[PDB]
Structure 1
Amino acid sequence: MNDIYKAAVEQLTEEQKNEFKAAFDIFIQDAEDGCISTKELGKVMRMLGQNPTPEELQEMIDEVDEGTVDFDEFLVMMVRCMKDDS
């Protein structure tokens, strides 16, 4: 994987990566799909307790995407969003 994403992903513990993967998997047909849609991305993030704004989701999609989000792109968006807690 990409090494920048590697700068985001190193922030996560193994418990975190596994918890996030179980949540992401709810939103794909495991047997046939690697990506969630941009509408599902807000849903998965909220399922992990994040509350991104729609303007945020668009920005993140613009900046992170290498319409759709695979697991490593999702991890980077999670890491980004986890840092805007107050």
Structure 2
Amino acid sequence: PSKIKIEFTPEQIEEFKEAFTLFDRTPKCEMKITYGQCGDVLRALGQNPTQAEVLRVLGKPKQEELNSKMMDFDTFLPMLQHISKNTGTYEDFVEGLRVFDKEGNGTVMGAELRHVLATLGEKLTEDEVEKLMAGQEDSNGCINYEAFVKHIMAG
């Protein structure tokens, strides 16, 4: 927290200060975020940390702290700097999805990839999977996993 030297230009800080303000859901409009929405703001600002990496920079909080512990921008900024230091290649991603390619034809069954993202690793909700998978399946309900990897990496 204190050891973190802030490297960002003052213009970047002001750009991040506004993105952080857009996430304000406080009743008094105090421009603060709950510990639970930190992941979202790091992600809105171009980062892709795991749920575990977010929890580590938050100092391993309880679910109660994620729901109702407030954070100001001054506390958020060193967390953004630390997360930006630390991801997996396109090749790793394609090889991971190839495991589910039964035939080796370049596609994976839509319902199978949806099931994998909602059961394995740091599970995504059925809602998160629905939103992410929207309009990605072909006429046969299949997914071109290397086109999908390019889609999420450009997102």
- Aligning the two structures, in what range does the TM-score lie when normalised by the shorter sequence? 0.7 to 0.9
Q: Which residue of 1 aligns with 2:18?
A: 22
Cα separation, 2, equivalents of 1:83 and 1:45: 13
Q: Which amino acid aligns with 1:50?
A: Q
Asked which structure has the greater RCO (Cα within 8 Å, sep 6+), the reply is 1
Decide whether the 8 Å contact of 2:32 with 2:72 is kept in 1.
yes
TM-score w.r.t. length of structure 1? 0.74
Max Rg structure: 2
Decide whether the 8 Å contact of 2:24 with 2:31 is kept in 1.
yes
- The structure with the greater share of residues assigned to helix is 1
Name the SS of the counterpart of 2:33 in structure 1: strand
Aligned Cα RMSD in Å? 2.5
Cα separation, 2, equivalents of 1:85 and 1:19: 24
How many equivalent residue pairs? Answer: 79
Deviation (angstroms), 1:80:
0.3
Cα separation, 2, equivalents of 1:55 and 1:29: 24
Decide whether the 8 Å contact of 2:32 with 2:73 is kept in 1.
yes
Question: 9, 12, 15: which one pairs with 2:8?
Answer: 12
Question: 54, 68, 86: which one pairs with 1:84?
Answer: 86
* Cα offsets for 1:8-66 (capped at 9, x unmatched): 32x11012101110100001158532421122111111111001111111111117xxx
- Residue 73 of structure 1 pairs with residue 69 of structure 2: no
Runs of 4+ in 1 over 4 A off after TM superposition: none
Name the SS of the counterpart of 1:8 in structure 2: coil
